[PDB]
């Protein structure tokens, strides 16, 4: 059976908001170690990977591994009604959500009824403020359907083109940095230039409230990895296949 308490309930609200628009239904893989979610979108262009470690929770019990098919819109709606306790019995078709912050609200959510990316190094890795990255993707999606991302040691460029015209955004490698989190840091072994659908990047930037920082990992002819840290708990990775 599974039982976990998260005093910072807000994290779980944000995680769901970051996911529900891209993924309707997913299998939450729960173990002694923590929570795992891996799932592709219905159009098979992208894949999300969530990790929430057991140590990120206040209390946590999982006797043995169990998987729960979760409708993410339903869980979002339930989480919209929120100290959180999650509880699933053995052999059950419901997850129980018990909220707090005398008043107690109990929600019983109905449950529903293989393929993994290998681990690799990347030619070109970019760290930047997450708001800056969200803004860039939002802006450029008003010019075209796709972004060309060019990653070199001195900077990263984003370019779109469409009916109205074209646009180029250049961010330099930051230098005299005041705060760590406002830095634009690039680690380049090989330069890379690849094309990605902006519709999907704007799905990914819904994870912005989780983290002040986003990490972009690229290699030639392989999927883009967009990474958000979940402070003290884990991470959320989005993978996006190139055009």
């Amino acid at each position: 059976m599974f039982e976990a308490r998260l005093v910072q309930g807000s994290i779980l609200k944000k995680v769901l908001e970051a996911l529900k628009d891209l993924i309707n239904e997913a299998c939450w893989d729960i173990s002694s170690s923590g929570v795992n979610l891996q799932s592709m979108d219905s159009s098979h262009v992208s894949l999300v990977q969530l990790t929430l470690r057991s140590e990120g929770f206040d209390t946590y019990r999982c006797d043995r591994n169990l998987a729960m098919g979760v409708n993410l819109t339903s869980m979002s709606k339930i989480l919209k009604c929120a100290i959180i306790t999650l509880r699933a019995e053995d052999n059950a078709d419901t997850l129980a959500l018990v909220f707090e912050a005398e008043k107690v609200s109990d929600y019983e959510m109905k449950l529903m009824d293989q393929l993994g990316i290998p681990e690799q190094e990347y030619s070109c890795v970019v760290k930047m403020p997450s708001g800056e990255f969200a803004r860039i993707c939002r802006d450029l999606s008003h010019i075209g359907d796709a972004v060309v991302i060019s990653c070199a040691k001195d900077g990263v460029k984003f370019s779109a083109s469409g009916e109205l015209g074209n646009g180029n955004i250049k961010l330099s490698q930051t230098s005299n940095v005041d705060k760590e989190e406002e830095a634009v840091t690039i680690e380049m072994n090989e330069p890379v230039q690849l094309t990605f659908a902006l519709r999907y990047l704007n799905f990914f930037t819904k994870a912005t409230p989780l983290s002040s920082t986003v990490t972009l990992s690229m290699s030639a002819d392989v999927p883009l990895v967009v990474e958000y840290k979940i402070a003290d708990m884990g991470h959320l990775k989005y993978y996006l296949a190139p055009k």
Binding site: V45, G116, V222, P223
Partner: peptide
């Protein structure tokens, strides 16, 4: 297509 990258 991302499937062709997944093992």
């Amino acid at each position: 297509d991302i499937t062709r990258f997944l093992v």
